[PDB]
Design a protein around this motif. Structure first.
Motif, PDB file in Angstrom:
ATOM      1  N   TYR A 193       1.703   5.079   1.529  1.00 10.32           N
ATOM      2  CA  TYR A 193       1.597   5.635   2.873  1.00 10.32           C
ATOM      3  C   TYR A 193       0.765   6.906   2.742  1.00 10.32           C
ATOM      4  CZ  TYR A 193       5.882   7.777   0.874  1.00 10.32           C
ATOM      5  OH  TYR A 193       6.825   8.354   0.053  1.00 10.32           O
ATOM      6  N   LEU A 194      -0.001   6.957   1.654  1.00  4.52           N
ATOM      7  CA  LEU A 194      -0.873   8.081   1.337  1.00  4.52           C
ATOM      8  C   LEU A 194      -2.345   7.676   1.381  1.00  4.52           C
ATOM      9  CD1 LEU A 194       1.084   9.463  -1.709  1.00  4.52           C
ATOM     10  CD2 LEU A 194       1.102  10.323   0.640  1.00  4.52           C
ATOM     11  N   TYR A 195      -3.186   8.601   1.834  1.00 10.91           N
ATOM     12  CA  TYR A 195      -4.623   8.364   1.934  1.00 10.91           C
ATOM     13  C   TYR A 195      -5.368   9.159   0.875  1.00 10.91           C
ATOM     14  CZ  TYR A 195      -4.124   6.015   6.436  1.00 10.91           C
ATOM     15  OH  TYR A 195      -3.808   5.123   7.429  1.00 10.91           O
ATOM     16  N   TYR A 196      -6.636   8.820   0.662  1.00  7.77           N
ATOM     17  CA  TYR A 196      -7.464   9.537  -0.303  1.00  7.77           C
ATOM     18  C   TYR A 196      -8.881   9.632   0.237  1.00  7.77           C
ATOM     19  CZ  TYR A 196      -9.557   5.054  -1.574  1.00  7.77           C
ATOM     20  OH  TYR A 196     -10.222   3.846  -1.531  1.00  7.77           O
ATOM     21  N   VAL A 229      -6.074  11.658  10.190  1.00  9.89           N
ATOM     22  CA  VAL A 229      -5.220  11.845   9.026  1.00  9.89           C
ATOM     23  C   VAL A 229      -4.599  13.245   9.070  1.00  9.89           C
ATOM     24  CG1 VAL A 229      -5.228  12.037   6.508  1.00  9.89           C
ATOM     25  CG2 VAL A 229      -6.480  10.217   7.596  1.00  9.89           C
ATOM     26  N   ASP A 276       0.855  -1.180   0.000  1.00  9.30           N
ATOM     27  CA  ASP A 276       0.000   0.000   0.000  1.00  9.30           C
ATOM     28  C   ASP A 276       0.887   1.224   0.000  1.00  9.30           C
ATOM     29  OD1 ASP A 276      -0.684  -2.172   2.016  1.00  9.30           O
ATOM     30  OD2 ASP A 276      -2.696  -1.421   1.468  1.00  9.30           O
ATOM     31  N   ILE A 306      -1.773  13.321   1.827  1.00 12.90           N
ATOM     32  CA  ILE A 306      -2.311  13.153   3.166  1.00 12.90           C
ATOM     33  C   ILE A 306      -1.766  11.873   3.769  1.00 12.90           C
ATOM     34  CG2 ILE A 306      -4.368  14.472   2.632  1.00 12.90           C
ATOM     35  CD1 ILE A 306      -5.887  12.232   2.058  1.00 12.90           C
ATOM     36  N   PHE A 307      -1.057  12.049   4.879  1.00 12.83           N
ATOM     37  CA  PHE A 307      -0.443  10.955   5.618  1.00 12.83           C
ATOM     38  C   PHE A 307      -1.374  10.577   6.755  1.00 12.83           C
ATOM     39  CE2 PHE A 307       2.794  13.949   4.140  1.00 12.83           C
ATOM     40  CZ  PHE A 307       3.577  13.128   3.339  1.00 12.83           C
ATOM     41  N   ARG A 336      -6.687   1.464   8.118  1.00  5.74           N
ATOM     42  CA  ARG A 336      -6.560   1.438   6.670  1.00  5.74           C
ATOM     43  C   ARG A 336      -7.774   1.949   5.891  1.00  5.74           C
ATOM     44  NH1 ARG A 336      -4.337  -2.214   5.782  1.00  5.74           N
ATOM     45  NH2 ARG A 336      -3.252  -3.187   3.998  1.00  5.74           N
ATOM     46  N   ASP A 337      -8.985   1.707   6.398  1.00  9.00           N
ATOM     47  CA  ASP A 337     -10.188   2.128   5.673  1.00  9.00           C
ATOM     48  C   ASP A 337     -11.196   3.020   6.391  1.00  9.00           C
ATOM     49  OD1 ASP A 337      -9.684   0.576   3.108  1.00  9.00           O
ATOM     50  OD2 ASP A 337      -9.745  -1.097   4.547  1.00  9.00           O
ATOM     51  N   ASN A 338     -11.794   3.919   5.613  1.00 11.81           N
ATOM     52  CA  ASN A 338     -12.793   4.869   6.091  1.00 11.81           C
ATOM     53  C   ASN A 338     -12.492   5.429   7.471  1.00 11.81           C
ATOM     54  OD1 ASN A 338     -14.538   4.649   3.716  1.00 11.81           O
ATOM     55  ND2 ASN A 338     -14.936   2.564   4.462  1.00 11.81           N
ATOM     56  N   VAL A 339     -11.328   6.053   7.557  1.00 11.17           N
ATOM     57  CA  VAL A 339     -10.834   6.673   8.767  1.00 11.17           C
ATOM     58  C   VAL A 339     -11.349   8.103   8.792  1.00 11.17           C
ATOM     59  CG1 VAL A 339      -8.780   7.403   9.960  1.00 11.17           C
ATOM     60  CG2 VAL A 339      -8.784   5.269   8.708  1.00 11.17           C
ATOM     61  N   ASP A 340     -11.620   8.623   9.981  1.00 11.38           N
ATOM     62  CA  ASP A 340     -12.122   9.986  10.103  1.00 11.38           C
ATOM     63  C   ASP A 340     -11.064  11.041   9.840  1.00 11.38           C
ATOM     64  OD1 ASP A 340     -14.998   9.771  11.004  1.00 11.38           O
ATOM     65  OD2 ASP A 340     -14.013   8.523  12.545  1.00 11.38           O
ATOM     66  N   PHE A 400     -11.406   8.642   5.007  1.00 12.35           N
ATOM     67  CA  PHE A 400     -10.217   8.469   4.187  1.00 12.35           C
ATOM     68  C   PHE A 400      -9.767   7.026   4.206  1.00 12.35           C
ATOM     69  CE2 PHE A 400     -10.430  12.826   5.498  1.00 12.35           C
ATOM     70  CZ  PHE A 400     -10.112  13.523   4.333  1.00 12.35           C
ATOM     71  N   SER A 401      -9.087   6.616   3.146  1.00 12.20           N
ATOM     72  CA  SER A 401      -8.598   5.254   3.062  1.00 12.20           C
ATOM     73  C   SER A 401      -7.201   5.247   2.480  1.00 12.20           C
ATOM     74  CB  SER A 401      -9.525   4.408   2.186  1.00 12.20           C
ATOM     75  OG  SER A 401     -10.825   4.328   2.744  1.00 12.20           O
ATOM     76  N   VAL A 402      -6.485   4.161   2.716  1.00 11.20           N
ATOM     77  CA  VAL A 402      -5.141   4.031   2.189  1.00 11.20           C
ATOM     78  C   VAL A 402      -5.245   3.616   0.730  1.00 11.20           C
ATOM     79  CG1 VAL A 402      -2.954   2.849   2.373  1.00 11.20           C
ATOM     80  CG2 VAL A 402      -4.322   3.249   4.408  1.00 11.20           C
ATOM     81  N   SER A 455     -12.397   8.905   0.481  1.00 15.28           N
ATOM     82  CA  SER A 455     -13.204   7.791  -0.010  1.00 15.28           C
ATOM     83  C   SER A 455     -14.705   7.914   0.230  1.00 15.28           C
ATOM     84  CB  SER A 455     -12.699   6.467   0.577  1.00 15.28           C
ATOM     85  OG  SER A 455     -12.806   6.446   1.988  1.00 15.28           O
TER      86      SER A 455
END
Lengths: 518, 104
Positions: free
Chosen positions: A225-228, B29, A223, B13-14, B21-25, A245-247, A230
């Motif tokens: 180390y950046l999120y987007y 971030v 993966d 965005i780190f 890993r998913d649908n984090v608030d 956000f997701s990875v 979602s």
């Protein structure tokens, strides 16, 4: 060095010296007397009128010129194959030109009874436009180059040019050039001519296709180390907004962050080979992409290098986005599809956007509590920092070089028709039969003579070009794609002669067979 | 001043330490802020500018349209994306016939 001595030999063949290839070609030509030894003004007016987009002003001269700006003038199909299947790139380095075994013949026509005899004392004039002071006519994909088949005897094309025009009229800045106002070498049968030329540094043409695409360069196992973003909504219903956000991972490559984006575009109309799928209307010119220069429209052709079509839709092609050659013997006007050969710019779909598609989408507003997010289609996209692309492929029947216009600025001056661009390309070589007056009156007359002995010349030409090769260095395990002939039996041999003695090139042949990573 | 705004996918965005890993608030971030380059680079969520779209005349009024995307023009000047302590250092420039300002 006289009448009964050959002034040169027939040199024709190639030598493969490792990282270099030397092609040498000899053809035998014929040069008529053009324009009755006159320089004549021409325009769309003396051409029988026309539309504004086709207006022009220029001059036709009594000179002919040599042109060998096509790959098949130097490479036999077998050689092209050797080149294509084994090198990642190539480019011209040196050039050596020769004219010899000149024969000037005089034609006599008395009472329909025509007869041809040698005129030993007659000369032929030759000169090279070493300083590019004449309008450069080569590199406009003109007919009249050396024929691909060595045995063919060809006629030398007539030289003409254009300057500024305002309709069918000239303007103050319009230039008139007289080729006689150039020093030229004169030769009688028994004399010969020759010169050398150094190709200026030009990048290697990429004779490879990429074995991976711009959007698929990551490690499919790790993966980022950046999120987007979602999720902007928590589910249907009133006031359900959020920000989740997701990875960016293997499971969603489309969203991953990338360092480089696809090359520029200029959307072309999409045409189908299976006719019933096209609109029932005339859109050849109306629906064509174009550019305007001082009120005149020109077809954007072939334009930026873009992939001819999406995966599998092979029946589609850009209205004027690829080169199309005619098959052997094909006519000049309104010829059917089966009598033409349309090049396929597919191998570059790994980096260049598709010609008949949009570059992408961009936002066109500020989404808010009241307004929804909106996007618009990018129909044409200029260069952006971070772009990467491949240039148009080159073909056995295609052009080799082009003269980069002498201007204040330009960008990636690689000829759009494919080839090598140069500020100082191989110079134009002009030739002409020196006029030989018929018997003049025995009483002085100030008027210029207009009565000439009818003549034409013939001789041999030799063009030797040294090419530099960039050999393949792949660590790919499985075999590559290679250009090959068909195993299956057939009436004639591909790239051979007819039973009538007609040589023909069955299909176009690019250079992108071997692969290379991005 | 509109610091509460950010381009849909225009900045890096780190994740904060331990973020899932998913649908984090949003609070889990860290969104980079590309502000210092507003002195030369246009704003990401704005139009580049406006261009005329017709010939104003006695009958027609002058009209303009919004430039949503603008490619390079001679005379342009700009800064490249900033680099971060947690960010990448280098990238391999794709081996291709052409490219422009191959800065990752």
């Amino acid at each position: 060095d006289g009448v009964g001595s050959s002034s040169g030999n027939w040199h024709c063949d190639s030598q493969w010296l490792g990282d270099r290839v030397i092609t040498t070609s000899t053809r035998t030509w014929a040069l008529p007397t053009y324009n009755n030894h006159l320089y004549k003004q021409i325009s769309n007016s003396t051409s029988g009128g026309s539309s504004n987009d086709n207006a022009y002003f220029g001059y036709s001269t009594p000179w002919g010129y040599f042109d060998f700006n096509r790959f098949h003038c130097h490479f036999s199909p077998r050689d092209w194959q050797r080149l294509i299947n084994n090198n990642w790139g190539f480019r011209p380095k040196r050039l050596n030109f020769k004219l010899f075994n000149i024969q000037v013949k005089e034609v006599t026509d008395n009472n329909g009874v025509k007869t041809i005899a040698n005129n030993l004392t007659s000369t032929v004039q030759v000169f090279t436009d070493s300083d590019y002071q004449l309008p450069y006519v080569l590199g406009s994909a003109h007919e009249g180059c050396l024929p691909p088949f060595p045995a063919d005897v060809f006629m030398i094309p007539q030289y003409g040019y254009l300057t500024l025009n305002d309709g069918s009229q000239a303007v103050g800045r319009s230039s008139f050039y007289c080729l006689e106002y150039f020093p030229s070498q004169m030769l009688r049968t028994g004399n010969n001519f020759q010169f050398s030329y150094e190709f200026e540094n030009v990048p290697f043409h990429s004779s490879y296709a990429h074995s991976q695409s711009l959007d698929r360069l990551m490690n499919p196992l790790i993966d980022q180390y950046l999120y987007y973003l979602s999720k902007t909504i928590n589910g249907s219903g009133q006031n359900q907004q959020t920000l989740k956000f997701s990875v960016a991972g293997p499971s969603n490559m489309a969203v991953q962050g990338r360092n480089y984006i696809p090359g520029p575009s200029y959307r072309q109309q999409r045409v189908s080979t299976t006719v019933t799928q096209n609109n029932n209307s005339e859109f050849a010119w109306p629906g064509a992409s174009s550019w305007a220069l001082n009120g005149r429209n020109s077809l954007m052709n072939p334009g930026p290098a873009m992939a001819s079509h999406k995966e599998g839709e092979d029946r589609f092609f850009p209205l004027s986005g690829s080169l199309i050659f005619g098959k052997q013997g094909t006519g000049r006007d309104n010829v059917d599809a089966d009598k033409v050969m349309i090049t396929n710019e597919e191998e570059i779909k790994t980096t260049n956007p598709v010609a008949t598609e949009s570059y992408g989408q961009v936002a066109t507003n500020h989404q808010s509590a009241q307004a929804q997010a909106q996007t618009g289609w990018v129909q044409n996209q200029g260069i952006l920092p971070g772009m990467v692309w491949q240039d148009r492929d080159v073909y056995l029947q295609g052009p080799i070089w082009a003269k980069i216009p002498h201007t204040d600025g330009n960008f990636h001056p690689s000829p759009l028709m494919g080839g090598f661009g140069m500020k100082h390309p191989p110079p134009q070589i002009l030739i002409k039969n020196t006029p030989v007056p018929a018997d003049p009156p025995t009483a002085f007359n100030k008027d210029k003579l207009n009565s000439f002995i009818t003549q034409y010349s013939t001789g041999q030409v030799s063009v030797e070009i040294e090419w530099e090769l960039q050999k393949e260095n792949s660590k790919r395990w499985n075999p590559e794609i290679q250009y090959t002939s068909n195993y299956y039996k057939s009436n004639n041999v591909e790239f051979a002669v007819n039973t009538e003695g007609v040589y023909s090139e069955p299909r176009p042949i690019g250079t992108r067979y071997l692969t290379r990573n991005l």
